[PDB]
Every structure is written in C-alpha cells, then in structure tokens.
Amino acid sequence: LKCHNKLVPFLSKTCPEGKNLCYKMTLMKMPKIPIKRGCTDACPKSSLLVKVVCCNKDKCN
Amino acid sequence: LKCHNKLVPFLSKTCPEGKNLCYKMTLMKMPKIPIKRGCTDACPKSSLLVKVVCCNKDKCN
C-alpha cells in the first residue's frame, strides 16, 4: 500500500508491514487542509477538534 | 497506564494492553490547545502542522 504522508500534495511512502490503511487528519472546521497523513494499522479515533479519514486503496488519503 | 483522551481537561482512560505511551497532538502554532489525546504503542510522527508529545507516566499528556 502507498499513502500520502505529508500535508503538502503528491509525496508518498510505501506502508510498512502491518499498516494496511491510509489515514488523513483534518480540523473538523477546516476539512480542506490535511494536518497529518500517513499509514496506519487501525484507524485512529476522531476527537472533538480532529476528523480522521481512513481508506485502503493506493494514495486514497 | 492512564492517559488523558479528550481535548477537554481531566477525562482519562486506562490504556489497552500494548499501548504504554500517552500522546498529545497540538498545532505547532498553538501549543496550548490539545487537538487529540489518548494512548498509543509507538509515538506518532510529527508533521509540518502538528506536534506530537509522548510520555509514559500516568496522565502525563
């Protein structure tokens, strides 16, 4: 799997064994700006301030 | 281990087996506001926009 791993566009990495999900964190009030992206094994939980998208195709985050 | 797990004060949970670190995410420009907190096994990486503290004593985050 390959995921975007920076908050600028395009850049990516191949995920390590065990992490088969891409994730994207955004501020709930600003959905257009990724604040943190990368690979993960289990999808991180959202908070009152942060939304977390998880997806499992290449560069889907 | 017990960690703060919300961005309001006080609230906490006991970490599941395998997660022996507390973490706190902040926006690099706003260190005073936690945007996401909880338990983790390996300390999450920082990004250009987000700082991540990790610590291993009770409610240290």
Domain CATH code at residue A46? 2.10.60.10
Residue A5: Cβ within 10 Å count: 20
List Cβ neighbours of A34 (8 Å cut-off, separation of 6 or more): A4, A7, A24, A25, A26, A61
Domain count within chain A: 1
**A27 and B35: CB-CB below 8 Å?**
yes
d(CA A35, CA A44): 14
**B50 and A25: CB-CB below 8 Å?**
yes
Does A45 lie at the interface with B, CB-CB under 8 angstroms? yes
* Contact status, residue B49 vs residue B27, Cβ threshold 8 Å: yes
Q: How far is A48 from chain B (nearest CA, A)?
A: 7
* Contact status, residue B56 vs residue B22, Cβ threshold 8 Å: yes
Q: Which of B3, B35, B45 to mutate to test the interface with A (most CBs of A within 10 A)?
A: B35
Of B7, B48, B49, the CB nearest to A49: B7
Residue with tokens 């920076």: A6
d(CA A50, CA A60): 19
Q: Which long-range contacts (CB under 8 A, 24 or more apart) does B44-47 make?
A: B44/A36, B45/A38, B47/A6, B47/A7, B47/A35, B47/A36, B47/A37
In angstroms, what CA-CA distances link B8 with A5, A53, B29, B38?
28, 22, 19, 12
Q: How was this structure determined?
A: X-ray
Instruction: Work out whether strand B30-40 and strand B12-14 pair parallel, antiparallel, or are unpaired.
Output: unpaired
Which tokens belong to B58? 């009770």
| Domain hosting residue A61, numbered range | 1-61
